Paper text:
Each of the knob structures starts with the conserved sequence motif [CP(D/E/A)G(Y/W)], in which the initial cysteine residue forms the first disulfide bond with another cysteine residue in the knob, and the motif forms a type I β turn. The compact globular folds of the knobs are maintained primarily by several disulfide bonds, a feature that is similar to the core of other small disulfide rich proteins or domains such as voltage-gated sodium channel antagonist mu-conopeptide, CnIIIC.
The two antibodies with 4 or 5 cysteines (BOV-5 and BOV-6) both used a cysteine pairing pattern. In every case except for Bov-5 (having a free cysteine close to the C-terminal end of CDRH3), the cysteines occurred in pairs, and every cysteine participated in a disulfide bond. Two or three anti-parallel peptide segments make β-strands or β-strand-like backbone conformations in the knobs, and the first disulfide bond forms between the conserved cysteine residue and another cysteine residue within the second segment. A typical example of this feature is the knob of antibody BOV-5. The knobs of antibody BOV-5 and BOV-6 form one-layered structures without the second layer seen in antibodies BOV-1–BOV-4. Interestingly, deletion mutations in the region encoded by the DH2 segment in BOV-5 and BOV-6 reduce “two-layered” knob structures to “single-layered” ones.
Author numbering:
A (entry chain B): 2 to 9, 11 to 216
B (entry chain A): 3 to 119, 125 to 177, 182 to 233, 241 to 264
């Protein structure tokens, strides 16, 4: 029902990695495996077909092979743009019945680290007129893609009404995230200071809004 | 360019219907297939309809799938009946390479004879010599891929967003933004100055609140107007963003 792939594969820049695709005689064993590359924000791209043939425009660092019921996608030299989810596939008993692999998330290590840039927006006048107040903490340009966010108000940590997204890769190959503090209008005016504290690789970048000046 | 069109929100136990057309080209001379991916899960084959009008389907889902063409074969439709929350996925339209060849085959440890058109030669239980068999070889792969249409199956109804301007309080770089708040379903598209802003724009992935409406923000590092489009609710808001006068 599904071809087995490793859940994730890691490698550093310029290193060779391989992604296997384990099926059975009914699919992979027939020797016409294809490979697909899924990058967020872009359409899926076909990399390999017929076990070894490269699609148009695909770099020569991608290569495919097959030994019995296991096919392999090989990247000879890793680049940052190669970070994606990779899927194998094959027909089964018909040219219209196909099964995909389980997917392999590829990560390319060794990229240069960078602290997060933090921007904290206060609630707008329009939202405050509706008796609501959302504080918006936007975090960008950090690598690696791991960040811890802490909200504070007059020196006290706020744990309720906080929603934080996971880190997502940007177009410049560094990561982004955002955090939301959903308050009422009266709550926003009761405190004198609100802070978004973003900790990344042991270093904390803090931004603060004061209602008395917004 | 392959384009999938259809609703982004469907109520459970109803029929999800999607259409695929091509821009720059015609689907009439190519086989067209459907592939979907649920969030955090593998790609899943749905089916295809070749140039001969014949439809093939994922066997485990055949009883719920219907893939049809029109008279010109310029547009291809997909129907998924009796949908549940498991049918929430991004649905892709593809062009598919499909060829069935008949070649001679041999058992384990046997090889075909030279220029046969046929007996097999090797060592095994069949003897040194045995007759080859004509077997179908299935060639299949997805060629072109559409951008995909995100479909959410849910009982919650459509909710248009509220767009609020974002501006700092009272610099080297002035940062403004727009908060696309409390909308359903995904997605929304955000541009700035009708696309005249090429760089300095960062739109962040949406968050899903304890409530259950999504919210995202876009910000520009520099009048400025964010163009928020929520096609599901036929909403288009162009919110002017002005920094505080102070």
């Amino acid at each position: 029902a599904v071809l087995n792939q490793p859940s994730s594969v890691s490698g550093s820049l310029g290193q060779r990695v391989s992604i296997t695709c384990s099926g059975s005689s009914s699919n992979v064993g027939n020797g016409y495996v294809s490979w697909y590359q899924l990058i967020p924000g872009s359409a899926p791209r076909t990399l390999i077909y017929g076990d070894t043939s490269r699609a148009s425009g695909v770099p020569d660092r991608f290569s495919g092979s097959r030994s019995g019921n296991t096919a392999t996608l090989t990247i000879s030299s890793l680049q940052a743009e190669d970070e994606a989810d990779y899927f194998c596939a094959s027909a089964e008993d018909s040219s219209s019945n196909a099964v995909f692999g389980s997917g392999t998330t590829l990560t390319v290590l060794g990229q240069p680290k960078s602290p997060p840039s933090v921007t904290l927006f206060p609630p707008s006048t329009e939202e405050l007129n509706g008796n609501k107040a959302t504080l918006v903490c936007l975090i960008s340009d950090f690598y690696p893609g791991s960040v811890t966010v802490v909200w504070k108000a007059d020196g006290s940590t706020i744990t309720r009404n906080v929603e934080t997204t996971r880190a997502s890769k940007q177009s410049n190959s560094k990561y982004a995230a955002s955090s939301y503090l959903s308050l009422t209008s009266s709550d926003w005016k009761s405190k004198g200071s609100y802070s978004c504290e973003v900790t990344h690789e042991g270093s904390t970048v803090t931004k603060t809004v004061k209602p008395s000046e917004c | 360019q392959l384009r999938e069109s259809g609703p982004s929100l469907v109520k459970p136990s109803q029929t999800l219907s999607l259409t695929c057309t091509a821009s720059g080209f015609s689907l009439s001379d190519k086989a067209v297939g459907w592939v979907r991916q649920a969030p955090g899960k593998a790609l899943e084959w749905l089916g295809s309809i070749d140039t001969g009008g014949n439809a093939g389907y994922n066997p485990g889902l055949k009883s719920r799938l219907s893939i049809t063409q029109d008279n010109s074969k310029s547009q291809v439709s997909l129907s998924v009946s009796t949908v549940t929350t498991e049918d929430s996925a991004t649905y892709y339209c593809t062009t598919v390479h499909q060829k069935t060849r008949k070649t001679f085959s041999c058992p384990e440890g046997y090889s075909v004879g030279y220029s046969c058109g046929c007996n097999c030669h090797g060592r095994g239980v069949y003897g040194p010599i045995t007759s080859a068999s004509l077997t179908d070889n299935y060639e299949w792969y997805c060629d072109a891929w559409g951008q995909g249409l995100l479909v959410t199956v849910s009982s919650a109804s459509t909710t248009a967003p509220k767009v609020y301007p974002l501006s700092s309080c009272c610099s080297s770089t002035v940062t403004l933004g727009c908060l696309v708040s409390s909308y359903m379903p995904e997605p929304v598209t955000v541009t700035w100055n009708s696309g005249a802003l090429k760089s300095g724009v960062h739109t962040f992935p949406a968050v899903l609140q304890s409530s259950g409406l999504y919210s995202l923000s876009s910000m520009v590092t520099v009048t400025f107007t964010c163009n928020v489009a929520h096609p599901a609710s036929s909403t288009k808001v162009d919110k002017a963003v002005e920094p505080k006068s102070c």
